Design a protein around this ligand. Structure first.
Ligand SMILES: O=C(O)CNC(=O)C(=O)O
Ligand SMILES: [Mg+2]
Ligand code: NI
Ligand SMILES: [Zn+2]
Length: 331
């Protein structure tokens, strides 16, 4: 078995290897990358996502989200308070302000210590989940707006034609902006490209150990757990590396820098934080190997998780027994 300790793997494809996205994913999996839940892909030196980022300031962040925490430093939830719209240029200035900017630090490890010590005492503002793309239309390799769609993959594998679409999302971050512990919708893959700015630190639980994280989460968030049998689908709970280590939960960590891709694999729980002003682009995707994970994915039916139009068909076809209850949650 390849990668039996489930370490995060880092890949350096050549420009020739960067042509065929599906083939490269399957290569990485042949080497055991999926066992970690997360892999890093450094693009060939010849590649670029676009020519410059000099003209992005007029993108609108219609609903910036202030991430307010509750709990203790290593075990907390966050809720998202909606703020007034602002442009990317306005948000960048805000991220660089004395109130929100990255503190002085020695290295990524020192910054990580500071994040876990102090996150809860601040409420950073995240421009998340903005439909759109920063890839140039002429970028032909690993262009996250030109991937094969999940609907087409389901149709190729299973023969059933379904409605729905699959487009990317932009994320504008600042120091301490936080992504809570989650797997993707329908335990899909994700791919995330850090277009510019400061790093993003990731934490990940190997898919084979995801239920260990879930059991810890039910213990640490006991009211949430009574409310919903899949409350990590709400994407609000944080647990620090120190708490994970104290409870014996297998995990790994890695920092993504500008110009790098990360891939999350089916049922790979992940969480993390931004080091300073940045912009990322991410999208979900599928492969043949996903289908079985899609069929087994948990679902929130309490009403909190509320998701895209396109998840309907995935539930309806892959999980027809759950469909009725899940759809009640959506309506
Ligand atoms: O970058 C973020 O805030 C969150 N991204 C992801 O969870 C991802 O790409 O799957
Ligand atoms: Mg612009
Ligand atoms: Ni994710
Ligand atoms: Zn729920």
């Amino acid at each position: 078995a390849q990668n039996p300790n489930c370490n995060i793997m880092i890949f350096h494809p050549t420009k020739e290897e960067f042509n065929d996205f599906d083939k490269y994913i399957a290569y990485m999996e042949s080497q055991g990358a999926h066992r970690a839940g997360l892999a890093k892909i450094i693009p060939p030196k010849e590649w670029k996502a676009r020519e410059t980022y000099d003209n992005i300031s007029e993108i609108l962040i219609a609903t910036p989200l202030q991430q307010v925490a509750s709990g203790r430093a290593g075990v907390f939830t966050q809720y998202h308070k909606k703020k007034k719209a602002m442009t990317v240029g306005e948000y960048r200035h805000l991220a660089n302000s004395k109130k929100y900017q990255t503190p002085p630090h020695q290295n990524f490890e020192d910054l990580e210590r500071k994040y876990w010590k102090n996150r809860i005492y601040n409420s950073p503002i995240y421009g998340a989940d903005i439909s759109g793309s920063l890839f140039d239309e002429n970028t032909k390799q690993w262009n996250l707006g030109h991937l094969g769609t999940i609907q087409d993959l389901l149709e190729k594998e299973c023969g059933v034609v379904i409605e729905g679409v699959n487009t990317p999302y932009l994320y504008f971050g600042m120091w301490k902006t936080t992504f809570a512990w989650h797997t993707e919708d329908m335990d899909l893959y994700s791919i995330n490209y850090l277009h510019l700015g400061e790093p993003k630190t990731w934490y990940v639980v190997p898919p084979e150990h995801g239920q260990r994280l879930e059991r810890l989460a039910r213990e640490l968030f006991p009211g949430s757990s009574r409310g919903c049998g899949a409350f990590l689908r709400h994407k609000v709970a944080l647990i620090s590396p120190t708490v994970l280590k104290e409870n014996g939960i297998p995990f790994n960590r890695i920092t993504q820098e500008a110009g790098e891709f990360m891939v999350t694999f089916p049922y790979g729980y992940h969480a993390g934080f931004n080091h300073g002003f940045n912009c990322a682009e991410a999208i979900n995707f599928a492969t043949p190997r996903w289908i079985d994970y899609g069929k087994m994915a948990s679902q929130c039916s309490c009403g909190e998780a509320r998701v895209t139009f396109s998840m309907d068909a995935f539930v309806r076809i892959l999980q027809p027994e759950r469909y009725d209850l899940w759809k009640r949650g959506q309506d």
